[model samples]
Target: RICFNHQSSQPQTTKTCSPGESSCYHKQWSDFRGTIIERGCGCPTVKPGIKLSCCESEVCNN
Candidate 1:
């Protein structure tokens, strides 16, 4: 029961995410070398960015 942004054009479940940070990465932003920091489910606890629905949330791999 968590949230995550799109990490790949063809992203799948269990994708990585940044729990507490200030970033919103797209599906094509999933890169290595830290160049692409996986975005968290929503924004930070203080400032959440994108909000997801209950069912659509699980499949939102990012």
Candidate 2:
């Protein structure tokens, strides 16, 4: 089961602006997707053979 907590405060991150001024901004991220595993002692499966992946190599644009 997943839990949703909206009363969470994320840390501020330095982001680049258009011209010439860097400012800290609060991140507004969300948990979009995940895979289901057999309750316990079971191998995790990728639905239809595809990993639930996302881009984490860099910060995302808000």
Candidate 3:
């Protein structure tokens, strides 16, 4: 599987999932820097007021 892998505060980087990673995840939130976006190979624990999406398709997090 593959996913968009990057943070809004850094250079964008898309990558493929390694063994055992079966999902692509997209996360969104806001802070002092305004809206923050993140994507990775799997779902991550998030705090309140944040949005998260996870899929098993290729590059689905994009």
Worst 10 residues of 2 by lDDT: 35-44
Q: What is the lDDT for 42 in model 2?
A: 17
lDDT of every predicted structure (CA atoms): 0.38, 0.26, 0.83
> Which parts of model 3 have CA positions greater than 4 angstroms off?
8-12
Q: Candidate 2 at 51: error in angstroms?
A: 37
Higher-scoring candidate on TM-score, 2 or 3 = 3
Q: Write the per-residue lDDT of candidate 2 for residues 7-52, one digit (tens) a residue.
A: 2233333333343322212223234453321111111234554333
Cα lDDT over the full model 2? 0.26
Residue-by-residue lDDT tens digits, candidate 3, 8-41: 6686688978888889898998889789888899
**How would the candidate models be sorted by TM-score, starting from the highest?**
3, 1, 2
> Which rank order by lDDT, best down to worst?
3, 1, 2
TM-score between model 3 and native: 0.78
lDDT string, candidate 1, 1-62, tens digits: 34454343335444443454333333222235533434434433332443332223443434
Give each model a TM-score: 0.23, 0.17, 0.78
- Residue pairs with backbone atoms closer than 3 Å in model 1 (clashes): 3-41, 5-62, 8-27
TM-score of 1: 0.23
For model 3 the local lDDT of residue 13 reads 80
- CA shift of 38, model 3, Å: 0.5
Best by TM-score: 3
